[PDB]
């Protein structure tokens, strides 16, 4: 929709600080920090799929809006996730051990913002077409 493309990173704020919340050791936070990666975007019938792509480190996941799915993240926490529209905005929740952490993507102008929040550690990141 407004989502569909490849989007390359182009800012970031606090991302270490909300990795070291998820309690994210040395080394990966390292990795993480350093990545500059694509974020592509599809859209097929009832099924959106999200792939990152960089030079250490691919993901991908595929999903139905408000249908719960197994997901496993860039750092290798096994996860619940839950992904819903709500006013124009991708709403995904994960949960894993009796803890929770949420992502949200959001349109604005030439931008794609992604906002992450782990307790009181929000981070903003900010992607555009490549
Ligand atoms: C390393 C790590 C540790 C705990 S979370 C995490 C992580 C890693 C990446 C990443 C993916 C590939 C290359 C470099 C970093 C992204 C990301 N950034 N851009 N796309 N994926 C990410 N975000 C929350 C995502 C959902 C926006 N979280």
């Given at each position: 929709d407004a989502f569909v493309g490849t989007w390359k990173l182009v800012s970031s704020?606090?991302?270490?600080?909300?990795?070291?919340?998820?309690?994210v050791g040395f080394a990966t936070r390292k990795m993480g920090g350093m990545a500059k990666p694509n974020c592509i975007i599809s859209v097929n019938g009832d099924v959106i799929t999200i792939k990152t792509e960089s030079?250490?480190?691919?993901?991908?996941?595929?999903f139905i809006l408000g249908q719960e799915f197994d997901e496993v993240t860039a750092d290798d926490r096994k996860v619940k996730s839950?992904?819903?529209?709500?006013?124009?905005?991708?709403?995904?929740?994960?949960?894993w051990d009796g803890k929770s952490t949420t992502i949200k993507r959001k349109r604005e102008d030439d931008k794609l913002v992604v906002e992450c929040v782990?307790?009181?550690?929000?981070?903003?990141?900010?992607?555009?077409?490549?």
């Open positions: 704020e606090n991302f270490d600080d909300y990795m070291k919340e998820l309690g030079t250490l480190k691919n993901t991908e996941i595929s839950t992904i819903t529209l709500d006013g124009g905005v991708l709403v995904q929740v994960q949960k782990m307790k009181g550690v929000t981070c903003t990141r900010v992607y555009e077409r490549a």
